[PDB]
Every structure is written in C-alpha cells, then in structure tokens.
Design a protein around this nucleic acid. Structure first.
Ligand SMILES: [Mg+2]
Ligand SMILES: [Mg+2]
Ligand SMILES: [Mg+2]
Lengths: 156, 97, 96, 69, 48, 96, 48
RNA sequence: ACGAAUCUCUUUGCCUUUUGGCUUAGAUCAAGUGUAGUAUCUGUUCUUUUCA
RNA sequence: AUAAAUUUUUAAGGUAUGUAUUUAUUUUUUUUAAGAACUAGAUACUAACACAAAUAGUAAAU
C-alpha cells in the first residue's frame, strides 16, 4: 500500500488537473488508481504544479532566509510563503545553508483506462440518444426498401 | 498590523516563568532516550487510546483502515516504531494539512 | 458603417467593369386602377445581378472553407478532446 | 438539458387563450367595500462605527464568536 | 508561537519544543477554503 | 357515471358506498385512479344517509320495533366515528 | 473585450484547457524583529 | 508609365460547429464471492508483379 | 380537611417511464488493404440468477 510516484500516473494526473481543475480531486483519483484525493492534491500543490518556484538561492533569498528563520523559530509554512518558495525546500536549502557550517503492463492498461476516459464528454443520456436516433434511421431505411421492393412488384 | 504582544510584555512574561521555575527548582524534561526502561508500556497506552476509537465501529472508512493498519504494525514492531519516532522528532518540521 | 460604405465602393467599381466590359467585349408607369406602380425592365441585367450575387456567395463560402482546412490542420499545441476544444481553445489563444 | 433561460414568457401568449371558469378560493368576495379619504495590590508583575459590510461588523463577530464557537 | 518556542525551551529539550511549535503551522482544508495557520493553536492535536 | 366517465371501470361502488378495486392495479392505474377529497368526502356523506334511511326502511317492513328504531339511529349518530370514516377527509369533523 | 470563462469548478461540456486558465507584496512588520530579539536578550541575560 | 478586372498566396479585420441556471463544493466515494454474456491486450508461422 | 384530567387520522412525497402492435385491396478523371492461418488466457463492465429467507429512489447506520 505504501506508494511512490511514477511519471506515468504523474502525467495522468497533470492531464486530469488540466481538465477537471484543481478542486474536484475525488474524480482525479478515479482515473488515477492506487491513490487518494489528499495524496493527489498533496503532490500537486507541494510539488507538481508548475507555477511553483524551484531554483537556487540568492543573497536576497539567503540573508532574507536566515533573517526570517531567525525571527520566527520553527514556522516553516509561514516563512515559505514569505519566500514564495515551497515549504520543505525552503527548510532543506536552509539546513544545507547551515550545513556549510561544519567541524510496464497494467500501468499501460490503466493508461488505456484514463486515456479512454477523457475522450468522452457527454454522459449516459446523450449516448442513449445517439443510439435511439440511429435505430430510427435504420427503421426508416428498412421501411423504404420495403416500399421500393413493393414498387418493383408495382403495388404502391 | 504585526504581532500584538510588543517586546515589553514578552520579556516581562518570560522573566516571570523563569523566576518561578528557578525558585521552583525545576529540571526540564529530556528527549525520550533510545534506551528506555518503561518505554514499551507508554507506547501500549497511547496505542490503546487510538485503538479505542475503532473498537465500536462496524464499517471502517478509508482513512480508518489506513489507521488500524498503522496501529497493528506498531504493536507488532515496537522497536521499529520507537526508532521511527525518535527520528521524526529529531528532524521533520513540515507536515501534511 | 464605414464597412458598408467601402463595400458600396467596391461593388461600384465592379459594376463599372461590368458595364464598360459589356462595351469592351462589344420608365415609370402608374395604374389609375390601383395605386400599384409598374416599372418596365430588361430580363438582362437582372441575370447579371443574380449571377454576381451567387458567385459572391460562392467565393466567400470557399474562402471560409479553405480557411476551415488550413486553420484546423495547422495548430497542434493545446490539448484537444474533440473539434470544439480545438475551436474554443484557439479562441483562448486569440485572447492574448 | 439545464439552461439559464435567456427570456421569459410573454403574458400575451396566455392572453389569447380561451378561459376555463374554475373557481378559486382566494377570489371569493372579501372586503367588498372601499374607503374614501376626506501593600498586596503591588505584588503582581504588571506595575502601573457602522461599517457598511458584514464580516467586519462588530455584531457579526459577536455572533460568530458565540455559535460556531 | 515565537513566544511559545521560548517558553518551551524552558521546560523541554529544544528539539521536542521545535516539533511542537512547528507542529502547529499547517494548511487547514475545509472543502475549498484552505489557509495556513499562522498564529493561533490547533486543539485537535493529541498533545494540545 | 362520474367514475365511468373518467374511464375508471375497475372500481366498484357496492350498495353501501364502499369503493373497491376489482383487479390488482397497475401502478399507472393507481395514479390515474386516486380520487379527491371531494369525491371521497361525498361518498362518506351519502353513506351516513344510507345508513339511517336503511334502519327506517327496516322498521317499516315490520322487522324491528319502534324502540329498537330509536335506539338504532341513536347508535348511529354516536358511533359515526366508526361506521364511516368521514374523518379521513375533513379532519375537522373530529369536533362533532 | 470580455475574456472567456475558465472555472475551476464546473466544466459543463468536458472541454480541456491549458492549466493556467484553471491554475502578496509586503514583507513582515518589525513587530516581529523586536519580538524575537527581545525574547532573545532577556533569554541570554537569564541563562547568564 | 500607371489604372482596372481575374487566379493564387500572406497579414489585419470578422469570429464562423467557439463552455447555458440554483441549493449543505448539492450529498456520498470504495469490503465481497460463483457462474455466465460481451468488450480487447499478446505471440507464432508462411508470403509482397498479371491475362483468358 | 381535596373535589383542578392534554391527546386519538388519511392521501403524497424490485421499479417508474417510454415504444410498436394494419384487420376489412379508393378508379389510370478517382482508388491501395501489407495479406492468410493458429492460440490462450488477463484486466474490465454487467445479471432481481445462485451462500430461519426475507430489501428498494422523502429520511439512511454504533
Ligand atoms: Mg419522487
Ligand atoms: Mg418535493
Ligand atoms: Mg427520487
């Protein structure tokens, strides 16, 4: 049950988000197997979402950091927003900044599943209509060639 | 608007607790030691406390089952878990929502 | 407004090439019975009119059609479930 | 098929119809009649409106300070 | 918090204390609404 | 007549004005056949009249006796809360 | 000119969209700076 | 020389099959088995011209 | 030395819903599919069908 993330399922997510939007997660974990809403959204907001800032320091970011982190002893999500940088990264790069001080199968089947799912937009009703209508067309054409062959007998 | 306390109040308060405790002659708590004589007991307690939530229930939802698992294993592997914890406190500063 | 004017000019000059080209390649009556009025006209020039209209409808129709072809074949960036995703989504590209 | 309406029904569409003659209750005669007008205390350590809005109001913050608690 | 983390530096090892004070700041999700908890104390915490 | 004219032919009024289905009902035929607080109220009311007028009809036939007559129709007017069920339709009548 | 609607919640036809249509300036107040450093000073006084 | 008409291409313009409502996000979110029907996912071997 | 007496009932909210059920005769210039055979099961969906015997679309459970 203890899971980690393949780029397979990861991409299936980013596709899903790219459709259903952020807030409908319990659907985003339908496509995606093996996973939950809070798991999905956890990885999304904390890692995957592109708008996040993953990059180096700067002396603005650094002196800024030791400043803030000294002022607020452990309050990381606060300080994180203060840096507009992800949480555990700010924590990590921080600790490193003081570490200078020293003395392919069923995944392809799930991908068939979701990959098939996205491409149908309607819902049960519309599809039911498509059927009903076509059945009507066949009925029409039949009734016609009835009449056509009756005309080949002359009786109209 | 910034934090409300003002440094003034802060300092007075801190000093208060200090004179109290010195006066009270108090030894602070240590970190739970790896070699502990009572330890398994305490862990028995805490885990029973979580267990009890689920004693009554007949249908367990997802998060629940996740839990009961984590417990049952924690009974099974006490040294494992205690090590896991003492790690977690020594380090992890960021948490799930 | 201005567009309607401009189009008026365009079909002016085009009309001019019709008439002149027809030189290059070569009343009002009333009813005292009823207030209906009666004008007398050639079967000519009505047909040039109608035909001109038809051909305009054609050429515009075909500009729009070839535009369908080209436009729908080219852009391959954004995700598409179906035709309307391509359509609408290209509207969102039109935005910025 | 759930759609925001774009319109409303002309009363006229109704108006052309022929009547029915059902009799309601609230039409039964009532008010047939018009009306016309003519030492120790030192010890301790501490030594000597209407805002158009809701959620910023003083009331609302009392309320939410009670109930949701 | 910053006041806490001190007051706990008094009575407990700087680690554990840190684990707590840092244990409060979290996101808090009700349905869509979600917000960091920058300031108060969350009582649902087992040690709260 | 009112019933058979709503095309409900599978309901029966017996002689005592009970209303009974003769044929287990298709649900649609239930919905089509719920009847109104009118029609029911009125059926009950007729029931009451039939009841009384019967007791007289008996006594004339010579099968009773003038005391048992008087007691009878007394009994009726008191035990209406049983013999009929008019209290289902106007529940107000639970004053009388 | 009015943009086109892209709403995190409803997606009534099933349309797919580039994410970014789906999806502070201030610093702190020195109230903090003073707070933590004052706590700090009284602290080190006390420990001494 | 320039003017005009026609065909073709490019750009701008026009938007061409170009998100249609409300309530507590409207609510809820995985605990099975036997057989059976249908959907469809792999591999293997042989072979790439014509007329009466 | 106390006499102090409320009530009482009906409908609504496996299945609804929908479809066809004509018998009795209305005048005379286009084009290329790589082709064929074999084989197994594995993930699915489903089914008022099967484990003292019984449940349905106003309400649901320590
Ligand atoms: Mg209903
Ligand atoms: Mg209702
Ligand atoms: Mg219903």
């Amino acid at each position: 049950k203890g899971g980690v993330w393949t780029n397979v399922e990861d991409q299936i997510l980013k596709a899903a988000v790219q459709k259903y939007g952020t807030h409908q997660w319990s659907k985003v974990a339908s496509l995606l197997q093996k996973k939950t809403a809070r798991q999905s959204e956890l990885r999304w907001n904390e890692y995957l979402n592109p708008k996040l800032n993953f990059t180096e320091f700067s002396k603005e970011e650094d002196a800024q950091l030791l400043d803030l982190a000294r002022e607020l002893p452990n309050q990381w999500r606060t300080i994180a927003d203060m840096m507009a940088r992800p949480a555990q990264v700010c924590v990590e790069r921080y600790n490193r900044l003081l570490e200078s001080e020293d003395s392919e199968d069923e995944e392809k089947e799930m991908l068939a599943e979701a990959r098939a799912r996205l491409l149908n937009t309607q819902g049960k009703k519309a599809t039911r209509k498509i059927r009903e209508r076509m059945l009507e067309e066949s009925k029409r054409i039949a009734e016609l060639q009835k009449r056509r062959e009756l005309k080949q007998a002359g009786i109209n | 608007n910034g934090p409300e306390i003002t440094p003034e109040e802060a300092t007075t308060i801190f000093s208060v607790m200090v004179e109290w405790l010195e006066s009270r002659s108090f030894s602070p708590i240590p970190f739970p030691p790896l070699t502990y004589k009572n330890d398994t007991k305490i862990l028995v307690l805490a885990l029973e406390d979580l267990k009890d939530v689920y004693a009554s229930k007949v249908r367990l939802n997802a998060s629940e089952r996740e839990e009961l698992a984590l417990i049952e294993e924690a009974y099974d592997n006490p040294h494992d878990t205690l090590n896991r914890i003492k790690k977690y406190l020594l380090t992890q500063r960021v948490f799930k929502p | 407004d201005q567009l309607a004017k401009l189009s008026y000019e365009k079909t002016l000059r085009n009309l001019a090439t019709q008439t002149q080209n027809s030189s290059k390649q070569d009343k009002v009556q009333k009813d005292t019975k009823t207030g209906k009025i009666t004008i007398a006209d050639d079967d000519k020039l009505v047909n040039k009119l109608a035909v001109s209209l038809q051909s305009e409808s054609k050429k515009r129709y075909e500009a729009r059609k070839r535009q369908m072809q080209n436009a729908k074949t080219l852009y391959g960036v954004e995700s598409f479930i179906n035709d309307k995703n391509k359509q609408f989504n290209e509207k969102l590209s039109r935005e910025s | 098929s759930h759609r925001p309406q774009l319109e409303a029904r002309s009363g006229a569409k109704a108006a052309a119809y022929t009547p029915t003659g059902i009799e309601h209750a609230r039409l039964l005669p009532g008010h047939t009649t018009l009306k016309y007008r003519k030492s120790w205390r030192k010890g301790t350590a501490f030594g000597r409106g209407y805002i158009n809005d809701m959620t910023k109001s003083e009331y609302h913050q009392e309320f939410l300070h009670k109930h949701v608690r | 918090f910053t006041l806490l983390n001190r007051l706990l530096r008094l009575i407990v090892d700087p680690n554990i204390a840190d684990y707590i004070t840092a244990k409060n700041n979290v996101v808090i999700n009700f349905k869509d609404m979600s917000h960091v908890n920058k300031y108060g104390l969350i009582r649902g915490l087992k040690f709260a | 007549l009112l019933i058979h004219r709503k095309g409900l032919t599978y309901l029966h009024l017996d002689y005592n004005f009970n209303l009974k289905p003769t044929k287990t009902l298709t649900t649609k035929e239930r919905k089509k056949s719920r009847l109104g607080n009118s029609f029911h109220l009125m059926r009950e009311l007729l029931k009451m009249m039939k009841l009384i007028v019967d007791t007289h009809v008996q006594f004339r036939l010579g099968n009773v006796d003038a005391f048992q007559l008087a007691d009878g129709i007394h009994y009726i007017l008191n035990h209406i809360g049983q013999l009929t069920g008019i209290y289902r339709y106007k529940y107000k009548v639970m004053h009388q | 000119k009015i943009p086109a609607a892209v709403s995190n919640w409803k997606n009534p036809n099933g349309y797919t969209v580039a994410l970014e249509r789906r999806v502070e300036n201030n610093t702190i107040n020195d109230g903090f700076m003073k707070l933590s450093e004052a706590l700090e000073n009284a602290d080190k006084k006390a420990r001494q």
